[PDB]
């Protein structure tokens, strides 16, 4: 009750004395651990280590079925640290948990863990694609409801379409920028738009201009300046063919006139776009 500081200070001293005696007795006979646990119902870290250092798989279940909230402590002790496979499966609870969820019959949990890992990862395009593929495979293998399966398929297709804009890079730009093939980080929408409309991409046709303008919805700074810069680059790369193709593929008030100009071909191309969009 009163004077909680003394109770908190004595608890640490009592727990430190039990851990030192269990370390010196672990090198001898293993029969004293059960007697110590029966005498004092505390210090479960010693029992968890004794049940993991040997090939006694039933001991961990026997010490957990006859206790009070022992699985929650065992999982916390395993996550903070035959027999080796069991120890690895017990420790696999965070981060790398997809294999454990697949082995313990949990396709939905494995898919959720893979999706979380893919969302948290942002430094390896190959790893992000592999995690998304594993999550899609787990969602397809899971026997859930039709609406849930359709929602998972839509969420996977959205991520695939968002990642394709960065995965479909040109072979000339990647070789000129001295970039890695699969050892590259997850580039953002602005980085992809800047790389697709850069000076290194000499073979920038209509696809490179259409892929850069469609990535403006995944920015979450100023898109008005980027829209003008891309329009200026598409006009300068044509050497006054690309602007007309982009306008035909986009089919109209997002572009500017005076802001983009601050001349003979633009005035003739802007007059035909107003009649086709009305």
């Amino acid at each position: 009750s009163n004077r909680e500081r003394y109770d908190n200070l004595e608890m640490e001293y009592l727990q430190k004395r039990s851990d030192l005696l269990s370390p010196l007795l672990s090198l001898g006979q293993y029969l004293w651990a059960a007697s110590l646990a029966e005498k004092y119902c505390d210090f479960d870290i010693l029992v968890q280590m004794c049940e993991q250092t040997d090939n006694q798989s039933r001991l961990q279940r026997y010490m957990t079925q006859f206790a009070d909230q022992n699985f929650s402590d065992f999982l916390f002790r395993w996550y903070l640290e035959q027999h080796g496979q069991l120890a690895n499966f017990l420790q696999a609870h965070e981060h790398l948990s997809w294999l454990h969820e697949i082995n313990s019959q949990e396709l939905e949990k494995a898919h959720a863990t893979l999706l979380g890992l893919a969302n948290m990862e942002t430094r390896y395009f190959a790893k992000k694609k592999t995690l998304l593929g594993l999550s899609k495979l787990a969602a397809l293998a899971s026997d859930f409801s039709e609406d849930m399966l359709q929602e998972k398929i839509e969420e996977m297709a959205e991520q695939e379409r968002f990642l394709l804009h960065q995965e479909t890079l040109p072979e000339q730009l990647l070789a000129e920028k001295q970039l890695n093939l699969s050892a590259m980080p997850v580039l953002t929408a602005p980085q992809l738009i800047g790389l697709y409309i850069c000076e290194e991409n000499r073979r920038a046709n209509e696809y490179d201009f259409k892929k850069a303008l469609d990535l403006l919805e995944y920015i979450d700074i100023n898109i008005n300046d980027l829209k003008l810069e891309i329009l200026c680059k598409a006009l300068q790369r044509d050497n006054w063919v690309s602007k007309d193709s982009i306008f035909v593929k986009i089919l109209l008030p997002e572009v500017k006139d005076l802001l983009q100009a601050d001349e003979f071909v633009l005035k003739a191309n802007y007059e035909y776009y107003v009649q086709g969009q009305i």
Binding site: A126, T130, G133, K136, L137, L140, A157, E160
Partner: peptide, 11 residues
């Protein structure tokens, strides 16, 4: 071997 999951699931 681990990269086959994306190939067997891509569109």
């Amino acid at each position: 071997c681990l990269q086959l999951a994306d190939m067997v699931s891509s569109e």
